[PDB]
Structure 1
Amino acid sequence: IRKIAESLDANLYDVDSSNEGRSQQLAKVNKNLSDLYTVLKTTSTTLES
């Protein structure tokens, strides 16, 4: 599967079949996006000003 699908796009992914890891799966990067939502505005504001 890997050496066939790499051609187009291989964004390797798989959930926890024990679908309670889902919780940390969400949170660990939900916090990251919450964080990254700022750099954009901060940088834009400083630069433009």
Structure 2
Amino acid sequence: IRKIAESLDANLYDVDSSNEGRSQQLAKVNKNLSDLYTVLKTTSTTLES
């Protein structure tokens, strides 16, 4: 399945089987996105300025 999925238009990932493990994964991956949200605004503010 893995080596047939890529041949077609597909994207791959990985997820924990447990439930609270998935919750912790969500928390840890959610923590590090506000910086991404802000960086583009910062660089624009510089650009137009």
- TM superposition score category, shorter chain reference: 0.7 to 0.9
Unaligned runs of 5+ in 2: none
Unaligned runs of 5+ in 1: none
Partner Cα separation in structure 1 for residue 6 and residue 24 of structure 2: 28
Is residue 18 from structure 1 mapped to residue 18 from structure 2 by the alignment?
A: yes
**Matches for 1:1-16 after TM superposition, within 5 Å:** 1-16=1-16
Partner Cα separation in structure 2 for residue 42 and residue 7 of structure 1: 38
The two structures, once aligned, show a CA RMSD in angstroms of: 1.6
- How many residues are treated as equivalent by the alignment? 49
Task: Give the % identical residues.
Answer: 100
TM-score (normalizing by structure 2) = 0.73
Q: With CA pairs under 8 Å and 6+ residues apart, which has the higher RCO, 1 or 2?
A: 1
